[PDB]
Design a protein around this ligand. Sequence first.
Ligand SMILES: *[C@@H]1O[C@H](CO)[C@@H](O)[C@H](O)[C@H]1NC(C)=O
Ligand SMILES: *[C@@H]1O[C@H](CO)[C@@H](O)[C@H](O)[C@H]1NC(C)=O
Ligand SMILES: *[C@@H]1O[C@H](CO)[C@@H](O)[C@H](O)[C@H]1NC(C)=O
Ligand SMILES: *[C@@H]1O[C@H](CO)[C@@H](O)[C@H](O)[C@H]1NC(C)=O
Ligand SMILES: *[C@@H]1O[C@H](CO)[C@@H](O)[C@H](O)[C@H]1NC(C)=O
Ligand SMILES: *[C@@H]1O[C@H](CO)[C@@H](O)[C@H](O)[C@H]1NC(C)=O
Ligand SMILES: *[C@@H]1O[C@H](CO)[C@@H](O)[C@H](O)[C@H]1NC(C)=O
Ligand SMILES: *[C@@H]1O[C@H](CO)[C@@H](O)[C@H](O)[C@H]1NC(C)=O
Ligand SMILES: OC[C@H]1NC[C@H](O)[C@@H](O)[C@H]1O
Ligand SMILES: OC[C@H]1NC[C@H](O)[C@@H](O)[C@H]1O
Ligand SMILES: [Cl-]
Ligand SMILES: [Cl-]
Lengths: 602, 605
Amino acid sequence: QRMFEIDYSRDSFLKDGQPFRYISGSIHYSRVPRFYWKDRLLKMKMAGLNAIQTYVPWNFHEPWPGQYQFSEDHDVEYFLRLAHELGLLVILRPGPYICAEWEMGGLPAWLLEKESILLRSSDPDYLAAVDKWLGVLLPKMKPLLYQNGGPVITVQVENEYGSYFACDFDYLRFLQKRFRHHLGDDVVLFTTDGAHKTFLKCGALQGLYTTVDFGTGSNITDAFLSQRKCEPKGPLINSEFYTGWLDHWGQPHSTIKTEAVASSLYDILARGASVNLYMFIGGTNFAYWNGANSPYAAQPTSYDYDAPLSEAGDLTEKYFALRNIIQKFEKVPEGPIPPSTPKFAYGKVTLEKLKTVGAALDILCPSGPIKSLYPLTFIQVKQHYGFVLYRTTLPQDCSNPAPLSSPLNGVHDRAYVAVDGIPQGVLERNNVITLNITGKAGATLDLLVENMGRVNYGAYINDFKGLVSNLTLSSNILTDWTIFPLDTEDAVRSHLGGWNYTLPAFYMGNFSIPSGIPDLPQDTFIQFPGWTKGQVWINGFNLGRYWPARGPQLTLFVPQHILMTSAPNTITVLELEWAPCSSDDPELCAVTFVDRPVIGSS
Amino acid sequence: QRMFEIDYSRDSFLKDGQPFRYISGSIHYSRVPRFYWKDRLLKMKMAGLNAIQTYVPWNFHEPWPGQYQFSEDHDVEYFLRLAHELGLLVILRPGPYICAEWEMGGLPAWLLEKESILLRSSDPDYLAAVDKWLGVLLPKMKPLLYQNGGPVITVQVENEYGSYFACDFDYLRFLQKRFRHHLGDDVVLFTTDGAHKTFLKCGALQGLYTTVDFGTGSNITDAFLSQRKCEPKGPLINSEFYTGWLDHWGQPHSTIKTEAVASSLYDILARGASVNLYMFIGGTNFAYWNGANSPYAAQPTSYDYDAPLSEAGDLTEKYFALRNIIQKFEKVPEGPIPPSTPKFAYGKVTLEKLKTVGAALDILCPSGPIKSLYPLTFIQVKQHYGFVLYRTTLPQDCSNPAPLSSPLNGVHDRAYVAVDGIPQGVLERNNVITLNITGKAGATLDLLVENMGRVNYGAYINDFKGLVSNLTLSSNILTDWTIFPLDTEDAVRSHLGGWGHRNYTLPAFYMGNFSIPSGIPDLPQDTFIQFPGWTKGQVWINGFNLGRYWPARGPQLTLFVPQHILMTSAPNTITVLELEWAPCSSDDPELCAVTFVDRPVIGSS
Ligand SMILES: *[C@@H]1O[C@H](CO)[C@@H](O)[C@H](O)[C@H]1NC(C)=O
Ligand SMILES: *[C@@H]1O[C@H](CO)[C@@H](O)[C@H](O)[C@H]1NC(C)=O
Ligand SMILES: *[C@@H]1O[C@H](CO)[C@@H](O)[C@H](O)[C@H]1NC(C)=O
Ligand SMILES: *[C@@H]1O[C@H](CO)[C@@H](O)[C@H](O)[C@H]1NC(C)=O
Ligand SMILES: *[C@@H]1O[C@H](CO)[C@@H](O)[C@H](O)[C@H]1NC(C)=O
Ligand SMILES: *[C@@H]1O[C@H](CO)[C@@H](O)[C@H](O)[C@H]1NC(C)=O
Ligand SMILES: *[C@@H]1O[C@H](CO)[C@@H](O)[C@H](O)[C@H]1NC(C)=O
Ligand SMILES: *[C@@H]1O[C@H](CO)[C@@H](O)[C@H](O)[C@H]1NC(C)=O
Ligand SMILES: OC[C@H]1NC[C@H](O)[C@@H](O)[C@H]1O
Ligand SMILES: OC[C@H]1NC[C@H](O)[C@@H](O)[C@H]1O
Ligand SMILES: [Cl-]
Ligand SMILES: [Cl-]
């Protein structure tokens, strides 16, 4: 009964034998609480989109081999059925690598247990893992295919493989074969690459429909000409038409002008091309889900993207402008659009020190440390995200400053250094590979190492994290390590079992919200004036990383559904560098909730 | 164990042996949906108020003798417990007459079944009915008294009795006896009157503590001197310090400057006086609950009052200004204040005519009409609120226009007139007592008569409603009437029977539906409904009577729609009963419509 195909005669899609063109927007279900899925999708539908496009992050669903997460916020099948309910078609991008400014481009860190693994290639062990994953994911997606009564109209294989150095065509052919095994012979499979022959060379494959991506800076004729070299016939497709851009900590917030996005969108649509707006809503990298680029620069917690729907789902002037463009081509749904959420400034909330990381090792590492002659990586100690403590003893007297160094630039990505509980400062990947330290002979040398996000693009996606090479003190290699993987998420859930720099430490405070008020709790934004760099949880939910010292993001988005009115709300901060809490003024040791985000600070 | 008393020695109250003075604000639970009680009460607490003051409208709780309403939106006991739970004290004002720009000052219309009754007096039938009511209400209030562990610290007896002509001191003593009987000998009982000896003369009583009321235009020293003449010792008290004022249809919206309320408040508090701010939130006269003044002028649906909290509960500049003054005397609660609710513009919703009133008679009057030689009042036909259809036959040919008159000005308060389904215009209390009509001999003459609100103040609170005197056609008395009391609320809730029972246009019901999506955390939201092109009538959403609209007069153009009556997925049904002229005749279906907006317009030109 139901069919979706490429017709090579009208340079078109045919949906149930009818000319069809898609106008789609990207929304990542892993970047929006499920509480808000229907809000965002309905806002997208009201804009005149007839489809949405989404990535399936493998590492979001398979945190350990054979251990799966498909419930609640991880319920991709529900997310797709919801889109379908709303009258939206779906362009599925299941990877296995997705890029996406996301931790290791969606690839599970446990792949790195084979240290020599060649990711995104025909490496047999990489293929065997991919095959197992596809064996779990694709039979789920099969009933959601259009032909079987679901919303999924096309499926991307890999993601910009043409940008990767490997150029392993047998890898692409394997994915093609495995996608066909699980999904059948009708589903439209495609690939996406930059709009240039240099990208298309290694990214395009026979039997996979070749599509391009490009933003407002690209000559649209030339871009589609490049697609046409690969596909003389069939629909013109821009799979990621950029509505904005990504950010890095320390760099100015990226924006793209509404007039530019509207102008290019109209041009693309007028050509009869199918198009997807990347991103339509960007949302948030909660917890440790952000990625990074090479040379090492991490993307922030916010994935606002300057998208037409803001981080918290707000209707922007860009939203209305693009809706007006769509309305020139298609009738858009009638009625009022769901509103931007109300925001509430809960105001100042004082915190008090709970414990330093150093004093909390029983709770953070209840299994005990691992001893090693030389340092081990995050992967080797079986921890993928967050923080690992490296401990040794000083082999000599350091009454005069002595150089602590990582000659091979092997602090991945940042270390907070202490000696006998006295903070010495910070080592940084690519920036600070030496720090002068002092302490007595036999003093305890501690390095709290942060994985700031695995690189998600380029050759260096095999990003282990930790002390990945030796440390030297006064030119001598430091040996005899006591390494504590840190169970930060459990420890914060239990209030740490108690159910110029400062030592890394947890600070906690409470605030109440009245019950029986129809419009509370509301969404809010948490700000950290006087703090420096760390992690924040509210009611045990890890909202991400703050870094007001570096910017551009100052505030973090707090969705209302994690806030309660039946018992006090808890806020826990792990501050890594300097806390405003040693002063005699307790009101300084405090966070503030405001009703407007600040993501573009100078 | 717990104690609350007047300390006469030290011109003070004592709460548990400790000096105390109250800073209170009026909230009428009968004018706020219960869905929002905690919201309003918490904002009031956050303003620095340590008590609230409220009226108990008798008619709101006893629609017929022996039939009582104390549940859901009528749950006074719950409201008072909620206030207590928030740490607020309560000054209770149970009447039995409350004035309050409320229908008949709170008195039940069925009191008028005795035509010659003298309300607010020792009239035995009035007292008998008052006694029965107090014996139901006051035992419910007893456990909520401060000394029994509840919030209620003082209780008003009557309401500005000194403004009433009767000056019946037996009546005041009778109330005092009965309040003491039910509530006990410790409760502080007090009266409130205008701050002048001419008012205090008939309002004050030995044994009831005399308080005064006054707003920003009064000299504070003089006002409190007038109290002190009556109460040389004890706390100074302003029981109604006006934050704004009431409206009438056709008059500009009343406002009082923030700076004036703020300055007077500072001066009252600086004297050590206890004070209640009337109103703190005004809210809404939903359904037919509004009052009227004499000479006949009805107050509108909105009771915004220009209060510090707006009709929809919004934090205004006035709110923050008054909080700032209170902060100069007391510590005000810490923490952020619950916000103004979000408002949402659902937009235009088309309606279409369902049925005229004349066509819906079977559903509106399922028990059939009452026949009478001369017209009967609302009270006589056992209808208190809303609309009654009076029908007769023309005794003469009126091919040439013939004058239909109420010679004694007895259309109370408005009549929409039709002859054989042709609208003839409007008869109006005071303003138009004659209307020329045409029709053949034997043609059906209909007058749909609306009760626009029983006068709530003055001598003329015995306001019967309907045709209260004869009609004349060409000077001859019209006889042989068929009178249909109309169950509009029942009929609207059954979609004029469609859902079963589990220049002028004819008065008619117009209906339309709109949907709100489900699964959206922030929908439904509060809204405001506007009626462009409409004239005068009544409005319901999902069977809830939102009140009266009259964009033809103003100043209120929009009506407040609380979000809890709106539903998701299932269509919301809007019913408009238009009385005079609907924008629905033309080939433009788009004109027959209402519009939901996100800002109130209650102060338009
Ligand atoms: C894009 O390139 C084509 C040639 O391929 C040229 O004709 C055109 O001027 C360019 N368009 C724009 C907007 O620069
Ligand atoms: C550390 O101290 C030594 C000797 O004072 C000095 O030469 C060097 O520049 C310092 N190095 C760093 C990395 O601060
Ligand atoms: C550290 O140094 C030792 C001795 O040179 C060497 O065996 C080892 O490869 C190094 N380990 C790391 C993790 O760099
Ligand atoms: C905060 O609340 C938690 C649980 O929500 C409670 O156990 C604790 O006693 C409170 N602590 C403080 C410092 O307010
Ligand atoms: C109010 O009246 C008193 C005398 O009773 C007088 O002293 C004062 O001037 C008056 N106040 C104002 C503001 O006129
Ligand atoms: C009624 O009609 C008469 C003509 O017979 C005219 O004198 C009079 O003004 C009209 N009355 C009204 C109320 O319009
Ligand atoms: C109407 O007129 C008759 C005859 O004069 C009179 O007896 C009766 O009381 C009047 N009724 C009303 C309701 O005015
Ligand atoms: C409005 O909705 C109700 C319930 O679905 C239905 O009975 C009524 O017929 C509806 N009217 C229209 C015009 O849809
Ligand atoms: O936002 C930039 C963008 N580049 C192209 C990739 O395919 C996307 O996942 C992404 O990382
Ligand atoms: O709003 C005016 C105010 N007047 C005095 C009365 O006591 C109140 O009920 C009231 O009507
Ligand atoms: Cl996507
Ligand atoms: Cl009151």
